[PDB]
């Protein structure tokens, strides 16, 4: 009767929902995989628009490619594209501060 959309991490799933075994049955799982490098680049551009508008700087395309690939390589403790946009916003704040 009521349409729902749930969202848990794998960890909470195994630990909590899987434990229930009845409510789990009610819902329908859908795996969302981390984007590859290229998909991450496109996501990063779409968001680059807003991040530019908020920091008031302009983020190069190759800047974003480097953010994606670097953060794929030298962070390896959290996932994309959260990593990449975190770097992008870091850099934006850093540059705006560098304006002062």
């Amino acid at each position: 009767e009521l349409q729902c959309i749930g969202a848990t991490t794998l960890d909470e799933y195994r630990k909590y929902i899987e434990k229930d075994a009845a409510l789990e049955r009610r819902f329908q799982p859908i795996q969302v995989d981390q984007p590859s490098v290229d998909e991450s680049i496109q996501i990063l551009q779409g968001l680059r628009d807003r991040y530019e508008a908020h920091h008031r700087v302009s983020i190069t395309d190759d800047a974003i490619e480097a953010a994606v690939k670097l953060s794929d390589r030298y962070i390896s403790d959290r996932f994309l594209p959260d990593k990449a946009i975190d770097l992008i916003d870091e850099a934006g704040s850093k540059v705006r501060l560098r304006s002062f």
Partner: protein, 149 residues
């Protein structure tokens, strides 16, 4: 009309989406691939012609609708000298099967030398510390059932 034809293909699609395993009617860009998979491997891994033959054979039979058993797709023991490909072949295979070869389940069994480390393949018994995050291997297969352990 024609659209009122929920057929085997559509159940196959909702399965292969639900569980990661690819049960459906394979098409071009796949059959050509599965046939040429021997050549893909023998590109990535040089020499060692015999192995890639048997691995490609098993992947094909499994993917061709054969492999009636409820037992796993394949089971190989690669022996030989060092620096020959016993790991490179598996990396090539997981890469050609999926891409990036990073979906491959890699378990360095050289780490489970102890008697009790056998815990972290199956988890830690209920109640005991680490019970929730259990299954260094099992959770990896329940995450992605169609992979190369």
């Amino acid at each position: 009309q024609e659209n009122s034809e929920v057929t085997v293909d559509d159940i196959a699609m909702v399965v292969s989406s639900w569980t990661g395993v690819p049960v459906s009617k394979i098409a071009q860009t796949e059959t050509d691939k599965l046939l040429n998979m021997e050549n893909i491997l023998h590109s990535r891994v040089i020499g060692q012609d015999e192995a890639v033959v048997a691995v490609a054979k098993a992947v094909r039979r499994a993917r061709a609708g054969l492999k009636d058993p409820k037992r796993p797709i394949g089971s190989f023991i690669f022996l030989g000298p060092t620096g020959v490909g016993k790991t490179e072949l598996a990396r090539a295979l997981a890469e050609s099967i999926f891409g990036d070869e990073e979906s491959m389940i890699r378990i360095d069994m050289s780490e489970y030398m102890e008697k009790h480390s056998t815990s972290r393949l199956v988890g830690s018994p209920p109640g005991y510390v680490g019970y929730d995050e259990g299954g260094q291997l099992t959770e990896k297969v329940r995450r992605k059932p169609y992979s190369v352990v």
